Design a protein around this ligand. Structure first.
Ligand code: CLA
Ligand code: CLA
Ligand code: CLA
Ligand code: CLA
Ligand code: CLA
Ligand code: CLA
Ligand SMILES: CCCCCCCCCCCC(=O)OC\C(C#C[C@@]12O[C@]1(C)C[C@@H](O)CC2(C)C)=C/C=C/C(C)=C/C=C/C=C(C)/C=C/C=C(\C)C=C=C1C(C)(C)C[C@H](OC(C)=O)C[C@@]1(C)O
Ligand SMILES: CCCCCC(=O)OC\C(C=C=C1C(C)(C)C[C@H](OC(C)=O)C[C@@]1(C)O)=C/C=C/C(C)=C/C=C/C=C(C)/C=C/C=C(\C)C(=O)C[C@@]12O[C@]1(C)C[C@@H](O)CC2(C)C
Ligand SMILES: CC(=O)O[C@H]1CC(C)(C)C(=C=C/C(C)=C/C=C/C(C)=C/C=C/C=C(C)/C=C/C=C(\C)C(=O)C[C@@]23O[C@]2(C)C[C@@H](O)CC3(C)C)[C@](C)(O)C1
Ligand SMILES: CC(=O)O[C@H]1CC(C)(C)C(=C=C/C(C)=C/C=C/C(C)=C/C=C/C=C(C)/C=C/C=C(\C)C(=O)C[C@@]23O[C@]2(C)C[C@@H](O)CC3(C)C)[C@](C)(O)C1
Lengths: 171, 73, 177, 193, 187, 193
């Protein structure tokens, strides 16, 4: 599994604990888990940075008298969302993952959907890169940006739970 | 050499250095012209980085002083 | 194990009610004997000092430190009270000489008692005049056994003195001070 | 080595591997050897910590003077929680310097425990063989050769006892600190902890 | 052939196995441009100057001071010695050694085919011996002393303080010295 | 020469080479010759210094006058430390001139003790064979042939005694100077040291 995607940077194939050398047949599940984590992390990092200088106009509920511009930046912004809005967000995520972008087949654990690639959701109406060098570069860029976004989103979460902002002190 | 606590001064000079290095040209060879990194390392060596950072520092000094005279930094 | 130390008053056998052997090797038994012998000799010196000073004794004639105001007779007759009246320079001198002697005892015996050797045979500080330079090997074992027995009795003696000083009316022959 | 041929097992969890998270079979042998070394170091540190915390909570201080002007009982007047901070700075410096030297010396030894050594077998003389550094041959583990009268089977049984006691000691020292921090968490630990 | 230090950069072709201190660490490929004996000359001169500078800085800061010298810290020692007017006198041994040794040695490194290596002044009065193990020790201590003097000067200018050159002394070096109660509060 | 075939050894450090830091193993033979020469010169200097410091501490002075107007007892009216500053500068310059001549003529001899000579074997006539300089044939060491009645074994034993006494004398003179400069460090010096 040393020649697969993600083993491109200065470290080559970097598996210290050896998850995929102990179980080489478990690489596809780990790749799907990493790809979902990376995509959620890119969305989270972009939301963290963009909510600081961009805010929607108008109200959020028009019943709890809560504005888009009144939610501060972060965890407290998710606090001030009304319970119906939280229910709708969870319904959107559940419908988005259980049926539309389905990362897992199988009864309980979820292997990989058929003979597709790990993280090969959406389908049909999605850009399919030909020219395998370009496809390999695009996929490796996706994976590496996902990993960097995981670390960044974790750091901003660590900052937000001990401050009022995700910006570290001194910045 | 570094600015006195100014992060905006750091961004102008670093961006000028990166822009100059990507937009250099020696003997028709250039990163922007579609000419690969490894052989430009092979053909020029440290002369590439030295010339690029010298011109980038000149350009960054001009841009920093202009934006200081106008108002920003 | 077999070693020295045993004899009469126990039946010619080793004394250990609580086990404290059968978890000990040759190195550990050598450490046991070295610690026993050092404690024994220190305790014999300690009883010979406390008994001489507290009971009677002419005490050392002289002054003890010409500058500070102390006299040999001004130290007193109590054991612990006179030790505190010894000056700090004298205490540090005694402790430093003892430490130098034992560090050289550790670094001077090349078959170390924990790596061979004989436990309790420290270099120097024994007979400078060679009183036991002609004794037979059979007689020397008797003297070593006598040293061990007198040392154990002296260990009990020093702890009796310490108990009588700290908690009064313990050790009934020893008085309240 | 593999987690199957390892001295953890124990008779309490049915005589098999307790691992309910599947960690032992999800990683390679090098990670398992690192985990065994970390568990053993944790257990020994926790045994020392539990005994020291019990002693400091019973207010059993040394007779004498810690620093000139600072009594052992003066530091141990409060509980073990407010005790390490009452130590003078030089003493904490010397303790942590000795621990630093021990860790560096035991890690810089021939066959590392992840590269051919035995995880948890600390070398007897960590400060021996270092150029320009001389130390006495006091052994780090067993300065007195207590485990020289022990056979291989007795050594294995006492290694099993060491592992079980280290696990219990980790639970106990975390129990002590949590019982001080969160009163009423541990019912036995009353006030002075 | 990848370099030993950087496992993803290629090995520099001018550093094979000799010239003690060779860790295979040469990004920028400076060995191709700068001649390698000249670079060793410069490295070992910097190393020796930094070793003496570190020891002098720490020794003056700890309190050791020769008679009639200003009793100041090593941060203000330069200005104090210049104001006293004797710090110019240090230049004459430096001028003697540096001119009459370095200038012919640098010229012979650049010109002469057979010449002594960089740090090889053939000084060795006692006769310790210039073994390959001793050269590695010299260059390791020199690189350490270079980084050390850089850190010492930069921290001593920031704090204007005593020997540890941190904002709170050796307590910044050892975090267990500083209020372990907060660490215990999360256990 | 080699550090193995040298005369230090001694029964105090068991009977082997004492060197705990491995100084003699990292250096070549020439440095060992320099170390032995420096050790022996240090020991002889320290022996003379210890005897002179004890004589000055006992307030023992010559019957007479040091300089015209300055009695020996006038200089010795204080401790040995505040006696060197009471000697006139001319006398100390003459002492240092004789010492400089002795050191220069000792090192000027042939087979230097690194280049073939014996380390610590200062020859009998350092001021002999020098053009433009004349001296009587008073020997430096043993002007009286005391070590001419001794055999080789007695000479080796007394060389070992000299080395041991030199080491003890260095410890002693450093103790004297440190006790004067920092009082209370050496407890064996009452006031006049
Ligand atoms: C993109 C950022 C930026 C900005 C905002 C500025 C802005 C400015 N530059 Mg500037 N500059 C830049 C980039 C920039 N420069 C770069 C990349 C360089 C190359 C290193 C220079 C080199 C440069 C020089 C050498 C000079 C300026 C000067 C000026 C100022 C007056 C220009 C003028 O009126 O022309 C002048 C108008 C003319 C008609 C020119 C007459 C020419 C005859 C032949 C003489 C102005 C504040 C001038 C200045 O600081 O004056 C106070 C000046 O002398 N610039
Ligand atoms: C951090 C300390 C530590 C470490 C490194 C280990 C490591 C190990 N244990 Mg172990 N153990 C510990 C603490 C630890 N244990 C404690 C405290 C107990 C008592 C409950 C046990 C009880 C125990 C049993 C009964 C067995 C093992 C076994 C093993 C080995 C195989 C399991 C494995 O791969 O997990 C790798 C482990 C880790 C990577 C550590 C993960 C630590 C997580 C992050 C902490 C989660 C704790 C959580 C907060 C709950 C704490 C509450 C608690 C205080 C009550 C492995 C060498 C098995 C064995 O030896 O078989 C050969 C076995 O049968 N352990
Ligand atoms: C990188 C090396 C380096 C540098 C730049 C310095 C720099 C300094 N040190 Mg320093 N030091 C160093 C290494 C260094 N040190 C080391 C390694 C040690 C430990 C051994 C010390 C120990 C030390 C002490 C103890 C002191 C200094 C002091 C000083 C300061 C004044 C020095 C001065 O005035 O010199 C003046 C130089 C001279 C007087 C000698 C010049 C030689 C004369 C001109 C004759 C030239 C020779 C001639 C041609 C031939 C012989 C002639 C004759 C015999 C006939 C200055 C900031 C002093 C200070 O002010 O600190 C606060 C001070 O007290 N340093
Ligand atoms: C500066 C004085 C000096 C010098 C040059 C030597 C030199 C030598 N000694 Mg020696 N020695 C000395 C003082 C000295 N000694 C003293 C004072 C003692 C008494 C403790 C001894 C006790 C001693 C023993 C028992 C033996 C030697 C041996 C040797 C030889 C081999 C060891 C070696 O390579 O070390 C080279 C030594 C140095 C380069 C000196 C480094 C000193 C450092 C820089 C300073 C450290 C001092 C330290 C801070 C303590 C100072 C306080 C003090 C008052 C307690 C060598 C010729 C061995 C021998 O002869 O075997 C053949 C041997 O068995 N020495
Ligand atoms: C490190 C060596 C050393 C140093 C620096 C000093 C320094 C000093 N001594 Mg001193 N001394 C020393 C060793 C030393 N002593 C020794 C070893 C002895 C015992 C013999 C003495 C006995 C001594 C006396 C009795 C007096 C001094 C005095 C003095 C002070 C004045 C200088 C003077 O008159 O010198 C005199 C120094 C000597 C006579 C020592 C000579 C040392 C040589 C090397 C020995 C020669 C060998 C041989 C045995 C000498 C006799 C040979 C002859 C019969 C043929 C000065 C502070 C005087 C004083 O108190 O202040 C005025 C004084 O009255 N010293
Ligand atoms: C006024 C200054 C002066 C003069 C005129 C001389 C002259 C001489 N030196 Mg000279 N020297 C001087 C200062 C002087 N030096 C200084 C300051 C030093 C440094 C310490 C030296 C170091 C030196 C060395 C190292 C050597 C000379 C040698 C020589 C001689 C060269 C050839 C020769 O005749 O050899 C034949 C030698 C002689 C004929 C020797 C006879 C000289 C005696 C000592 C004259 C007696 C003078 C008398 C005591 C009055 C002087 C009083 C004074 C001490 C206050 C020559 C006579 C060389 C030589 O061979 O001389 C030994 C030699 O090797 N010198
Ligand atoms: C008219 C006369 C004309 C000339 C006649 C001939 C002259 C003879 C001649 O000059 O020879 C001089 C000579 C000779 C000779 C021979 O050749 C002779 C003559 C005949 C020949 O066969 C044999 C030999 C031998 C070759 C030898 C010399 C040896 C010397 C000087 C050794 C010197 C040695 C000083 C020391 C050890 C100092 C120690 C200091 C200490 C221990 C300090 C200290 C202390 C204390 C304070 C004490 C206590 C403290 O305590 C605590 C705190 O714990 C510890 C400590 C360390 O702080
Ligand atoms: C219709 C919905 C489409 C959704 C998908 C989408 O929109 O994807 C768009 C997309 C590409 C694409 C496309 C496809 C996806 C291929 C297909 C699409 O076409 C269709 C519909 O098929 C269009 C197309 C071509 O565009 C790519 C999006 C990529 C994205 C959004 C990548 C975020 C990285 C963030 C990082 C690396 C953060 C690092 C954070 C780091 C490194 C930190 O440490 C943070 C830091 O704070 C810390 C902790 C402390 C601070 O002091 C300092 C900073 C601030 C540094
Ligand atoms: C085979 C082998 O060699 O191993 C050996 C080693 C060893 C150790 C001796 C063994 C053992 C046995 C022992 C002694 C095991 C000890 C176990 C022990 C003593 C475990 C304490 C748990 C305390 C907890 C979980 C506290 C929770 C606390 C929680 C969850 C809370 O925060 C409470 C709360 O959250 C709720 C619940 C709801 C929230 O709304 C409100 C809050 C937040 C307040 C073995 C395994 O038998 C054999
Ligand atoms: C043949 C053979 O075997 O040779 C023999 C020779 C010989 C002589 C017979 C032998 C012997 C026996 C003897 C008597 C050995 C004696 C050894 C002895 C007596 C050794 C004292 C050390 C005192 C020290 C280090 C003081 C430190 C002082 C220190 C560290 C300080 O306080 C300095 C400091 O306060 C300052 C100044 C200010 C600040 O900076 C802070 C600090 C706190 C750091 C041997 C060993 O058996 C070997």
């Amino acid at each position: 599994v040393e020649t697969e995607l993600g083993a491109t940077g200065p470290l080559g194939y970097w598996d210290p604990f050896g998850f995929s050398v102990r179980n080489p047949e478990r690489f596809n599940r780990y790749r799907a888990v990493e790809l979902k984590h990376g995509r959620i992390a890119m969305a989270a990092t972009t939301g963290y940075m963009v909510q600081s200088f961009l805010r929607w106009p108008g109200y959020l509920s028009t019943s709890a008298n809560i504005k888009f511009a009144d939610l501060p930046n972060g965890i407290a912004a998710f606090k001030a969302i009304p319970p119906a809005g939280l229910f709708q967000i969870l319904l959107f995520i559940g419908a988005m993952e259980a049926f539309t972008w389905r990362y897992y087949e199988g009864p309980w654990p979820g292997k990989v959907p058929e003979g597709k690639a790990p993280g090969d959701v959406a389908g049909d109406l999605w850009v399919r890169y030909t020219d395998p060098e370009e496809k390999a570069f695009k996929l490796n860029a996706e994976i590496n940006n996902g990993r960097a976004a995981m670390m960044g989103s974790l750091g901003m979460l660590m900052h937000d739970h001990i401050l009022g902002t995700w910006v570290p002190p001194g910045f | 050499p570094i600015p006195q606590f100014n992060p905006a001064k750091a961004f102008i000079m670093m961006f000028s250095n990166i822009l100059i290095i990507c937009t250099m040209s020696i003997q028709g060879k250039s990163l922007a012209r579609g000419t690969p990194h490894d052989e430009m390392v092979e053909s020029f060596g440290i002369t590439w980085l030295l010339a690029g950072t010298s011109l980038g520092h000149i350009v960054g000094a001009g841009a920093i002083l202009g934006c200081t005279a106008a108002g920003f930094l | 194990s077999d070693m020295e130390g045993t004899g009469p008053e126990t039946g010619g056998k080793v004394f250990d009610p609580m086990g404290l052997s059968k978890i000990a090797s040759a190195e550990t038994l050598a450490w046991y004997r070295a610690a026993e012998l050092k404690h024994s000799r220190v305790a014999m010196a300690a009883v010979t000092g406390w008994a001489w000073v507290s009971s009677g004794g002419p005490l050392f004639p002289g002054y003890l430190s010409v500058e500070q105001g102390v006299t040999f007779e001004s130290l007193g007759r109590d054991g612990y009270a006179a030790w505190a009246a010894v000056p700090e320079a004298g205490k540090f001198q005694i402790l430093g000489v003892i430490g130098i002697l034992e560090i050289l005892s550790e670094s001077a015996v090349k078959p170390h008692y924990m790596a061979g050797g004989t436990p309790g045979k420290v270099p120097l500080l024994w007979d400078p005049l060679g009183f036991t330079a002609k004794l037979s090997p059979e007689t020397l074992a008797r003297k070593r056994l006598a040293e061990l027995k007198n040392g154990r009795l002296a260990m009990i003696g020093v702890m009796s003195l310490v108990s009588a000083h700290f908690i009064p009316n313990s050790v009934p022959l020893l008085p309240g001070s | 080595a593999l987690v199957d041929s390892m001295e953890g097992v124990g008779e309490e969890t049915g005589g098999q591997i307790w691992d309910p998270l599947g960690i032992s079979e999800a990683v390679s042998d090098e990670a398992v050897m690192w985990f065994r070394a970390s568990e053993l170091k944790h257990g020994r540190v926790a045994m020392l910590a539990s005994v020291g915390y019990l002693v400091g909570a019973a207010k059993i201080s040394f007779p004498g003077e810690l620093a000139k002007g600072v009594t052992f009982a003066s530091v141990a007047a409060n509980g073990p929680y407010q005790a390490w901070d009452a130590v003078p700075q030089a003493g904490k410096l010397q303790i942590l310097s000795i621990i630093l030297a021990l860790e560096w010396a035991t890690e810089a030894k021939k066959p590392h425990y992840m590269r051919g050594g035995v995880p948890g077998k600390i070398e007897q003389l960590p400060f021996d063989g270092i150029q320009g550094l001389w130390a006495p041959k006091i052994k780090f583990w067993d300065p007195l050769n207590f485990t020289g009268a022990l056979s291989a089977e007795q050594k294995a049984r006492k290694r099993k006892a060491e592992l079980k006691n280290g696990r219990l000691a980790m639970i106990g020292i975390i129990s002590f600190i949590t019982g001080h921090n969160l009163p009423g968490s541990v019912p036995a630990l009353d006030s002075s902890f | 052939a990848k370099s030993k230090a950087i496992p993803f950069l290629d090995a520099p072709p001018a550093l094979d196995g000799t010239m003690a201190g060779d860790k295979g660490f040469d990004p920028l490929l400076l060995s191709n441009v700068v001649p390698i004996q000249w670079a060793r000359e410069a490295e070992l001169k910097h190393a020796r100057i930094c070793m003496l500078a570190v020891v002098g800085w720490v020794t003056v800061d700890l309190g050791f001071t020769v008679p009639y010298a200003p009793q100041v810290s090593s941060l203000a020692a330069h200005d104090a010695a210049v104001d006293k007017g004797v710090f110019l006198g240090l230049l004459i041994p430096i001028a003697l050694v540096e001119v009459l040794a370095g200038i012919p040695k640098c010229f012979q490194i650049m010109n002469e085919p057979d010449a002594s290596p960089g740090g090889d002044y053939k000084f060795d009065p006692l006769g310790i011996g210039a073994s390959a193990e001793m050269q590695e020790k010299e260059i390791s201590n020199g690189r350490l002393a270079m980084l050390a003097f850089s850190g010492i000067v930069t921290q001593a200018a920031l704090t204007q303080g005593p020997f540890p050159y941190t904002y709170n002394g050796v307590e910044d070096l050892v975090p267990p010295m500083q209020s372990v109660q907060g660490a215990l509060s999360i256990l």
